[PDB]
Every structure is written in C-alpha cells, then in structure tokens.
Amino acid sequence: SRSSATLIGFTAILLWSTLALATSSTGAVPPFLLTALTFTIGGAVGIAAGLARGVSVLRQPWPVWVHGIGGLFGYHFFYFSALKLAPPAEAGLVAYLWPLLIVLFSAFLPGERLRPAHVAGALMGLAGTVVLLGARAGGFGFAPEYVPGYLAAAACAVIWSVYSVASRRFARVPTEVVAGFCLATAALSALCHILFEPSVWPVGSEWLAVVALGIGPVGIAFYTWDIGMKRGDVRLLGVLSYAAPVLSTLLLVVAGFAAPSGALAIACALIVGGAAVATLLARRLES
C-alpha cells in the first residue's frame, strides 16, 4: 500500500529526528569511527530482521552495490568533510537542501507527477529550517573561506537525494540488501578511520548512545526509508523530511537541552502548513 509505505518511510524521519539528542552523548568520538561502529550495528539489525523473516539476498549485480555503497558512504564522507571545512550551522543548512532536492528529483520518476503543492510544501519546510537553524546566538554568517565546506555540504545533499530517488529504480531489490550497504559503508569508514582519524573510542555510558544510534537512526531508519522510497510517496516524503529539524528541536526542548522560542513556533507552523498543502491540497489546488 502506498499510504502504508509512505507512513513507514516517515518513521525514518522520526528516527533521524533523535540524532541531536545522542550527538551530545557521543563526546569526542570522531565521525568515521562512529560511523563504522553504528553501521555495523545497523547492518546487523537488518540481518537479524531477515532471519526472523527467514531470509541468497546479498547476491546482487554491481549497479546495486554502486548505488548503495556510493549512496550511503558518499554522503557521509562529504558531510564529514563539510564539518572539517565549515562551521556546523551553515554546513547543516546547506546539506538540508536535500529534502527539496528529492521533491525536485522525483519529477524524473516515470510514474510520479510533481504538483505545485509538493514544491510549495517543500519550500515552506525549507523556510522553517532556515528560521530554526538561524535562531542560534551568532546567526548565519556565510564567509568565502568556508566555501569548500559549503560545496562538500552541497555534494552530501545531492548524493543522498539521488540515492533516495534512485532507490525507486531498484524497487525489485529487497530491503534487507541495505544491510550489505551498511556493512560495506562500515568497512570503508573503518579504513577512513585508521588513515585520517584520532583513536578516540567510546568510553563508559557513551557506548549506550552508540548502540542506540546503530539500532534506531541506522538499523531501522535506512530500511524503513528504503521501503518508503520504493513503494511510498517520494515527493511527499521529501516534503515531510523537513519535519526532522523541527522534531529534533522539540526533543531537545522536552529533554531540557533547549528552550522554547519564536523561531521554533514559526518553523512548526511552516512545516505543518507545508505538509498540509502537499498532502491535503495537492490535487485540489490544480483547479
């Protein structure tokens, strides 16, 4: 069912909303090692999920592996590079062009028809994200010396957007194959660690956050996102992805790590209005 798969895809957005909550618990653990650990756990969850369903699946042609490994590892590598070359606030904003990109790129899908409401819904969601991420004390100061980081952040957005949209092309490919993508990505991230990374391993309670990231925002989110991309409404899930920054901030406020703000209220209205325009009014606004 299309509504089901779309609802299923939205669970990935929910799980990715919890990232900022566990980011603080990571500590000084560098990104590639953290990726290697969490994606091994993530890939392991996918394997375990297949065993319960009683699932030869990893026998796939090379374009499948180019898509999955190039997708998952690609956007990870360039986003980590963006964090190296540019302040996190501007890097995060540039990368979060990816939901709009998915909406726009969904027009290349044969069965999908892009309506004005989808694009408008995405633009409202981007608008909310801009207000939110810019609500920091310093604000948004884009400086020419950080341009290599912005480009890396843009590369990240495009690679993830193409990976997501192109996943529908591989709709015949089983969801459990993503486990292969995660394990391969973890293997590569392990290599990038030994080469470019300081050896800082998780200690004490930091391990519990690592496992949470591995099971949730990785071990379930990538599989439930795969389902949404292959069987759900891609242009809608693009629109709904701008809920992640808002839900993320709402979590921190409830957790006590952040405070309620006008910017949060405005972002909330924009993403609620944006989702409503793209879901309820999509067909009705054509007349």
3-state helix, strand, coil in the chain (%, to 5): 75, 0, 25
DSSP string, 86-121: S-HHHHHHHHTTHHHHHHHHGGGSSS----HHHHHH
Q: What's the reported resolution, in angstroms, to a tenth?
A: 2.4
Structure-token pair, residue 260: 């309620």
Terminal-residue alpha carbon distance, the chain:
27
139: left (phi over 0), alpha (psi -120 to 50) or beta: left
Dmax over CA atoms of the chain, in Å, equals: 60
- Contact in structure between 73 and 188 (CB atoms under 8 Å): yes
Structure-token pair, residue 64: 């499948």
- Contact in structure between 71 and 181 (CB atoms under 8 Å): yes
Alpha helices, DSSP H, located in 146-282:
147-166, 178-196, 206-213, 221-231, 234-240, 243-255, 262-279
The technique by which this structure was obtained is X-ray
